[PDB]
């Protein structure tokens, strides 16, 4: 069965790694961040990883920091595809990551969108980024330290969701910096900027002494 908590919300624990409580997480958007973005992410055969995200996932994995995918899937509300297609596509993304030796620990997805047709056409649902619901829910489920967590995505809504969830930093794929008290949008445009992100993840790593 699809792990739906309601008709437009999917929440799924991935793998069986154990995380002690009060860890920070690495939150990642999916389309445009982990995989190449596309208008209609319904065909698993079309999925291609963004290799420049793989060092970040690997770093978090090795640091013992949970990696949490938080993705809006408005195409579901819009009738472009359904949860079965999401399951196939998302599974393919996780398989490709496995082949690169990296993994994630939880997937949350929100179908609701204002331009939908039918009962999923809920315009401002708490789980739909920029609303922080998926981050807050992952926080409850994994007992996360949200204030120390990081988020990476290619849309402003990812940065807004992070700020609203209580994070202090996020990295905007292909985006510009916006450094303010309380929240910094960090640019992620080249390998130097990836380094900044990796340093930030590494500082969160476990001391096994």
Curated annotation (Swiss-Prot):
| Any one GO biological process | carbohydrate metabolic process
Reaction catalysis annotation: D-glycero-beta-D-manno-heptose 1,7-bisphosphate + H2O = D-glycero-beta-D-manno-heptose 1-phosphate + phosphate
Q: What is its EC number?
A: 3.1.3.82
Keyword RNA-binding among UniProt keywords: no
Q: Tell me the compartments it is located in.
A: Cytoplasm
A Gene Ontology molecular function term for this protein is:
metal ion binding
Record family assignment: Belongs to the gmhB family.
Q: What is this protein called?
A: D-glycero-beta-D-manno-heptose-1,7-bisphosphate 7-phosphatase
Q: Which organism is it from?
A: Mesorhizobium japonicum (strain LMG 29417 / CECT 9101 / MAFF 303099)
Q: Which gene encodes it?
A: gmhB
């Amino acid at each position: 069965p699809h792990p739906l908590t309601e008709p437009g919300v999917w929440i799924e624990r991935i793998g069986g790694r154990v995380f002690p409580p009060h860890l920070p997480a690495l939150f990642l958007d999916r389309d445009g961040t982990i995989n190449v973005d596309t208008d209609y992410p319904s065909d698993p055969a079309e999925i291609v990883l963004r290799p420049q995200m793989l060092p970040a996932i690997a770093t978090a994995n090795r640091a013992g920091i949970p990696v949490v995918v938080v993705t809006n899937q408005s195409g579901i509300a819009r009738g472009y595809f359904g949860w079965s297609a999401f399951a196939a596509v998302n599974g393919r993304v996780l398989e490709l990551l496995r082949e690169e030796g990296v993994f994630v620990d939880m997937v949350l997805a929100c179908a609701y969108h204002e331009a939908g047709v039918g009962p999923l056409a809920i315009p401002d649902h708490p789980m739909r980024k920029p609303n922080p619901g998926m981050l807050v829910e992952a926080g409850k489920r994994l007992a996360l330290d949200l204030q120390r967590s990081l988020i990476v995505g290619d849309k402003l809504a990812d940065m807004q969701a992070g700020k609203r969830a209580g994070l202090a930093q996020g990295w905007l794929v292909d985006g510009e910096a916006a450094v303010q008290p309380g929240f910094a949008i960090r640019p992620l445009r080249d390998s130097s900027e990836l380094g900044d992100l990796l340093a930030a993840i590494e500082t969160l790593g476990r001391d096994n002494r």
